[PDB]
Design an enzyme around this catalytic site. Structure first.
Site, mmCIF file in Angstrom:
data_model
loop_
_atom_site.group_PDB
_atom_site.id
_atom_site.type_symbol
_atom_site.label_atom_id
_atom_site.label_comp_id
_atom_site.label_asym_id
_atom_site.label_seq_id
_atom_site.Cartn_x
_atom_site.Cartn_y
_atom_site.Cartn_z
ATOM 1 N N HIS A 1 29.016 43.637 46.813
ATOM 2 C CA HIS A 1 29.349 42.905 45.679
ATOM 3 C C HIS A 1 30.326 42.190 45.766
ATOM 4 O O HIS A 1 30.312 41.405 46.642
ATOM 5 C CB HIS A 1 30.319 44.593 45.490
ATOM 6 C CG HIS A 1 29.695 45.280 46.091
ATOM 7 N ND1 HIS A 1 28.027 46.017 44.471
ATOM 8 C CD2 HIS A 1 29.800 46.189 46.696
ATOM 9 C CE1 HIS A 1 28.471 47.103 45.425
ATOM 10 N NE2 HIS A 1 28.776 47.656 46.178
ATOM 11 N N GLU B 1 32.133 48.105 45.597
ATOM 12 C CA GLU B 1 32.804 47.124 44.614
ATOM 13 C C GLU B 1 34.146 47.665 44.764
ATOM 14 O O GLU B 1 34.732 48.828 44.201
ATOM 15 C CB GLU B 1 32.461 47.125 43.716
ATOM 16 C CG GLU B 1 33.072 45.943 42.383
ATOM 17 C CD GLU B 1 32.695 44.626 43.208
ATOM 18 O OE1 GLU B 1 33.247 44.338 44.305
ATOM 19 O OE2 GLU B 1 32.391 43.764 42.387
ATOM 20 N N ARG C 1 24.752 39.581 47.742
ATOM 21 C CA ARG C 1 25.057 40.198 47.217
ATOM 22 C C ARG C 1 24.065 41.372 46.794
ATOM 23 O O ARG C 1 22.347 40.960 47.339
ATOM 24 C CB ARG C 1 25.669 39.734 45.380
ATOM 25 C CG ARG C 1 26.834 39.667 45.435
ATOM 26 C CD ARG C 1 27.461 40.261 43.876
ATOM 27 N NE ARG C 1 27.428 38.733 42.672
ATOM 28 C CZ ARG C 1 27.267 39.117 41.221
ATOM 29 N NH1 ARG C 1 27.060 39.983 40.754
ATOM 30 N NH2 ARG C 1 27.804 37.725 40.830
ATOM 31 N N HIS C 2 24.179 42.582 46.076
ATOM 32 C CA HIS C 2 22.941 43.384 46.307
ATOM 33 C C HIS C 2 21.958 42.920 45.038
ATOM 34 O O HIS C 2 22.927 41.873 44.191
ATOM 35 C CB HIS C 2 23.156 44.106 45.744
ATOM 36 C CG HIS C 2 24.207 44.167 44.481
ATOM 37 N ND1 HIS C 2 23.649 43.905 42.794
ATOM 38 C CD2 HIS C 2 25.484 44.245 43.831
ATOM 39 C CE1 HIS C 2 25.116 43.741 42.054
ATOM 40 N NE2 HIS C 2 26.152 44.066 43.482
ATOM 41 N N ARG D 1 22.014 50.163 44.686
ATOM 42 C CA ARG D 1 22.156 48.608 44.881
ATOM 43 C C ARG D 1 22.434 48.113 45.906
ATOM 44 O O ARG D 1 21.227 47.315 45.786
ATOM 45 C CB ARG D 1 22.685 47.840 43.059
ATOM 46 C CG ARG D 1 24.318 47.873 43.317
ATOM 47 C CD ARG D 1 24.816 47.313 42.075
ATOM 48 N NE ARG D 1 26.523 47.386 41.935
ATOM 49 C CZ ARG D 1 26.949 47.845 41.460
ATOM 50 N NH1 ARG D 1 26.934 49.265 41.838
ATOM 51 N NH2 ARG D 1 28.886 47.905 41.542
ATOM 52 N N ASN E 1 23.885 44.842 35.538
ATOM 53 C CA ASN E 1 23.950 42.727 35.542
ATOM 54 C C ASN E 1 23.093 42.896 34.280
ATOM 55 O O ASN E 1 23.839 41.690 33.576
ATOM 56 C CB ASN E 1 23.505 42.269 36.963
ATOM 57 C CG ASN E 1 24.393 42.610 38.335
ATOM 58 O OD1 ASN E 1 24.135 42.860 39.428
ATOM 59 N ND2 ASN E 1 25.704 43.018 38.113
HETATM 60 O O1 LIG Z 1 36.028 39.758 36.346
HETATM 61 P P1 LIG Z 1 35.319 38.890 37.824
HETATM 62 O O2 LIG Z 1 36.005 37.758 37.794
HETATM 63 O O3 LIG Z 1 34.195 39.382 37.929
HETATM 64 O O4 LIG Z 1 36.435 40.219 39.026
HETATM 65 C C1 LIG Z 1 35.152 41.089 39.933
HETATM 66 C C2 LIG Z 1 34.350 41.369 38.853
HETATM 67 O O5 LIG Z 1 33.466 42.447 39.524
HETATM 68 C C3 LIG Z 1 32.466 42.822 38.744
HETATM 69 O O6 LIG Z 1 31.218 43.331 39.110
HETATM 70 C C4 LIG Z 1 31.667 41.831 37.691
HETATM 71 O O7 LIG Z 1 30.384 42.052 37.758
HETATM 72 C C5 LIG Z 1 33.020 43.850 38.140
HETATM 73 O O8 LIG Z 1 33.252 45.263 38.350
HETATM 74 C C6 LIG Z 1 35.037 43.207 38.554
HETATM 75 O O9 LIG Z 1 35.987 43.286 37.164
#
Ligand SMILES: O=P(O)(O)OC[C@H]1O[C@](O)(CO)[C@@H](O)[C@@H]1O
Ligand SMILES: O=P(O)(O)OC[C@H]1O[C@](O)(CO)[C@@H](O)[C@@H]1O
Lengths: 191, 191
Positions: free
Chosen positions: A143, A78, A8-9, A58, A15
């Site tokens: 992502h 993402e 990932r980034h 990112r 985050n």
């Molecule tokens: O809720 P989870 O398990 O993080 O599923 C994918 C998720 O990835 C994310 O980037 C989490 O940081 C959210 O934008 C997205 O809902």
């Protein structure tokens, strides 16, 4: 033998704040990861490495630290959380309590209001997978949700397991497709 | 008949920063809720009411907005996350990947290093439920995990349902226990 590196980034500002989606830049130690990644990649002595990223800042910013040229894919963007974009989990529970409940029911096909589902995500990743298959050494800086989809494909996972695959930050998964399936190596870059 | 009102502390500083546990205070809108709560209780037209809180500042500060006395129960303290206290989900995923994955498989019995499980919390809350069962009108200002355990008892939910029961912020649950089961009314205080 060819190896596909997935990561990932580096740690984004959102985050750090515990917020989902958005298009924010890398944090301080997020950048230190971009540098650490550049080091690890060089030490791997990979022959003709192709590098892919998304249109999100990112991922792009993380690739910059590598020095080598890279390519941008929109399909690697993402998952769209839709109306819940940039909210924390607490905020989603309070402002969309019924929507939040429906997710846990079926995380694979559930769609937030005006957003994408893991199923939608898998569809737009099809062409990304086809190209990946006909390549040798490749590094994909993407992502969490995207990584889960690609990882499910190579590690042969079901639609049930997919939405819950382990994809932490600052960790590179080196996948080596073999005859019996796929070998995996996890490299944690502690910064 | 009498009613048991269940709700969480107003939005805290850590809630806003996407972090779990800790002993933080109320945010600006977290305080607005404390006052909006007093107005809701006022409109109920109750003659006598017992207000209980935990030792956590966030619950105490919320009770302070009522203008009435309250009792503090250590048993109403939020579940202990151990080493993961005051961390975000992303943070927990990265530094404690195995631990994070193990929780998902058994959310009820799992304990973070030096922490508590939902099972422990249920046991710890036994004397609270017993008293709640032998009282009249009561207002319990507690936490998300604690609230789920209490709500599970009154609404007859299994240990599998318990960890996923809906308990958003700024939402009051008015429970009216009867012969068997319990009546439920969900009131959202927008602030
Ligand atoms: O809720 P989870 O398990 O993080 O599923 C994918 C998720 O990835 C994310 O980037 C989490 O940081 C959210 O934008 C997205 O809902
Ligand atoms: O976070 P979960 O798994 O929904 O469980 C309730 C949680 O409430 C928190 O306060 C924050 O989510 C944690 O301390 C506790 O684990």
């Amino acid at each position: 033998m060819r190896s596909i590196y997935l990561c990932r980034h580096g740690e984004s500002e959102l985050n750090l704040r515990g917020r989902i989606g958005g298009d924010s830049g890398l944090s301080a130690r997020g950048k230190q990861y971009a540098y650490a990644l550049a080091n690890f990649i060089r030490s791997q002595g990979i022959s003709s490495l192709k590098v892919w990223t998304s249109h999100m800042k990112r991922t792009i910013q993380t690739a910059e630290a590598l020095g080598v040229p890279y390519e941008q894919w929109k399909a690697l963007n993402e998952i769209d959380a839709g109306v819940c974009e940039e909210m924390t989990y607490e905020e989603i529970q309070e402002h969309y309590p019924e929507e939040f409940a429906l997710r846990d029911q079926d995380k694979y096909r559930y769609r937030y209001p005006k957003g994408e589902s893991y199923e939608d995500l898998v569809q737009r990743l099809e062409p990304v997978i086809m190209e990946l298959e006909r390549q040798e050494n490749v590094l994909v800086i993407c992502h969490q949700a995207v990584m889960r989809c690609l990882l499910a494909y190579f590690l042969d996972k079901s639609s049930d397991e997919l939405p819950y695959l382990k994809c932490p930050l600052h960790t590179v998964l080196k996948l080596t497709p073999v005859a019996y399936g796929c070998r995996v190596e996890s490299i944690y870059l502690n910064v």
